[PDB]
Write a protein that binds this ligand. Structure first.
Ligand SMILES: CC(=O)N1CCc2ccccc2[C@@H]1CC(=O)O
Lengths: 300, 237
């Protein structure tokens, strides 16, 4: 179990850690989060009580270092920092606990949800989408635009998701215009899987990261990317069978975790009706179809 | 963006543009078989690609052999249209290539955009004008060259004959659309109006009769009357 201490909590905030969230009052005695199931990935995120604009947060792996949060009164946000003095960090985290001013990461043993949502997400790939090499953790917020969006304005603050554009030369072989537009298998298998992502694990990892950035920060470009990566698979007549069966599990858990009252903003009606009812893979997403119908029938 | 009656005069500026109408590409007759069923038979079709400023019409004849052994022909027809328009553009020198292509039917947008990926500076747009280019096959000489074709063929016409010697492009396009709207609404009566006087001839190299300026005014009135008469008949007005 790892710990993320907080120096203090000078401003009232809602704090998310992975799929959980809790509230901290202004100047409340709060010194962070204890008992974190070390994993391969976590996210800690913030939405200030006095301004719910800008949700923001940090993706991190407890195995890469000792991280803590300190509020910056000049920039007005909670900042992640790495503590390079391990003896100092151990001194804090064995004491702050000893004072009992930390909240415990509340994991139920039956609940496998965080790893089902982040199975293919890895920090090394996160750090290529969010470029900031001096830190081992990665900052994302509600406003950051994607590289693709920028192409249609600060490259340092962009999300470098893989560009997917169904009406592009990359997606359409000259001489195969109708074929490749109606069946995106070439673009999925040769261009994306074999060429760019190299394997399905990296593809699913970016798909999962995009979903989570959309849900936790309300990042619109991440939502576009999530939907694009689903539609690319579903609109391909030829998809390895291991990929289809795994996709159904991935999407099921994403739909299961989505807030019920956030459906009007996090689910694209066109993409989902196409994937579940029209596409080549309409019959290949049995579990996702079943949760979507019984949880969000109005979208369909 | 889409074209409409606000930016209508823009059609006659000096940026080359082409209308593309695909409604006569896939054409069939519907008849009854021997078991009693109903079967279709394709007949030759055409793509109507018209530069509205100069009158130039690139009539690509779609020969029925295109369809042999193919499935989902109404879908294929859109992609075949897009393939041929792209080929036309590619064949042209750069300074003659269109800056914009306006499709009369929105279903043509994605096929044409995909086929035109090599030309990212050519804008592909729909229109909110209801244009009557589906009645192109009511023009006898166009219908005749399409039906007689035995292989794919491109035929060039000036759909304005020599009118631009005397009137503006704007006026010529209005006359063209009036004639075609009348032909679409009551083809036989519209043809009567045009061929009523055997002393006014169609030049071997023209599509329409050689009317004087004052005869065109009369003809246009008669076509407006035909269109309004048919409206009243249809809606009981
Ligand atoms: C695009 C278009 O309408 N063209 C260019 C190609 C071409 C070729 C043969 C005859 C006419 C045209 C017309 C003439 C013109 O409008 O400038």
């Amino acid at each position: 179990m790892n710990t993320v201490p907080f120096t203090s909590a000078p401003i009232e905030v809602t704090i998310g850690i992975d799929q959980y969230s809790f509230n901290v009052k202004e100047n409340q005695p709060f010194h962070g989060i204890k008992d974190i199931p070390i994993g391969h990935v976590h996210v800690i995120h913030f939405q200030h009580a006095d301004n719910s604009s800008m949700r923001y947060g940090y993706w991190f792996d407890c195995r890469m270092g000792n991280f803590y949060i300190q509020y910056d009164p000049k920039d007005g946000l909670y900042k992640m920092m790495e503590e390079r003095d391990g003896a100092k960090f151990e001194n804090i985290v064995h004491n702050f606990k000893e004072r009992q001013m930390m909240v415990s990461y509340p994991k139920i043993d039956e609940d496998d949800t965080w790893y089902n949502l982040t199975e293919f997400v890895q920090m090394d790939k996160i750090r290529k989408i969010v470029r900031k090499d001096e830190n081992q953790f990665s900052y994302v917020d509600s406003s950051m635009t994607t590289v693709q969006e920028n192409e249609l304005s600060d490259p340092a603050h962009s999300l470098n998701y893989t560009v997917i554009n169904f009406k592009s030369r990359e997606a359409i072989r000259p001489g195969h215009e109708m074929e490749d537009f109606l069946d995106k298998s070439y673009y999925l298998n040769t261009v994306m899987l074999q060429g760019i992502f190299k394997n399905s694990s990296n593809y699913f990892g970016e798909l999962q990261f995009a979903f989570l950035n959309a849900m936790f920060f309300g990042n619109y470009g991440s939502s576009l990317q999530w939907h694009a990566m689903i539609e690319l698979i579903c609109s391909s007549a030829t998809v390895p069978k291991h990929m289809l069966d795994k996709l159904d599990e991935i999407l099921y858990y994403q739909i299961k975790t989505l807030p019920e009252q956030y459906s009007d903003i996090l689910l694209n009606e066109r993409v989902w009706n196409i994937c579940l009812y029209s596409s080549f893979q309409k019959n290949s997403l049995h579990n996702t179809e079943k949760i979507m119908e019984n949880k969000y029938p109005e979208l369909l | 963006g889409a074209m409409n009656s606000s930016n209508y005069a823009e059609l006659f500026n000096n940026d080359i543009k082409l209308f593309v109408d695909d409604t006569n590409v896939y054409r069939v007759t519907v008849h009854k078989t021997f078991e009693g069923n109903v079967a279709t038979k394709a007949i030759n079709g055409c793509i109507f690609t018209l530069n509205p400023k100069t009158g130039h019409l690139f009539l690509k004849i779609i020969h029925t052999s295109v369809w042999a052994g193919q499935k989902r022909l109404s879908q294929l027809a859109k992609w075949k249209t897009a393939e041929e328009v792209s080929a036309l553009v590619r064949s042209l020198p750069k300074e003659e290539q269109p800056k914009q292509i306006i499709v009369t039917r929105k279903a043509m947008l994605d096929p044409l955009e995909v086929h035109m990926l090599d030309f990212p500076n050519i804008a592909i747009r729909p229109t909110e004008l209801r244009l009557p280019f589906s009645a192109a096959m009511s023009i006898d000489k166009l219908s005749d060259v399409v039906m007689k074709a035995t292989e794919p063929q491109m035929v060039l016409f000036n759909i304005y004959d020599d009118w631009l010697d005397r009137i503006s492009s704007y006026t010529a396009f209005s006359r063209l659309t009036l004639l075609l709207r009348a032909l679409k609404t009551n083809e036989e009566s519209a043809k009567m109006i045009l061929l009523s006087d055997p002393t006014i001839t169609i030049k071997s190299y023209h599509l329409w009769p050689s009317f004087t300026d004052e005869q065109w005014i009369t003809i246009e009135s008669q076509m407006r009357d035909l269109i309004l008469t048919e409206y009243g008949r249809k809606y009981n007005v």
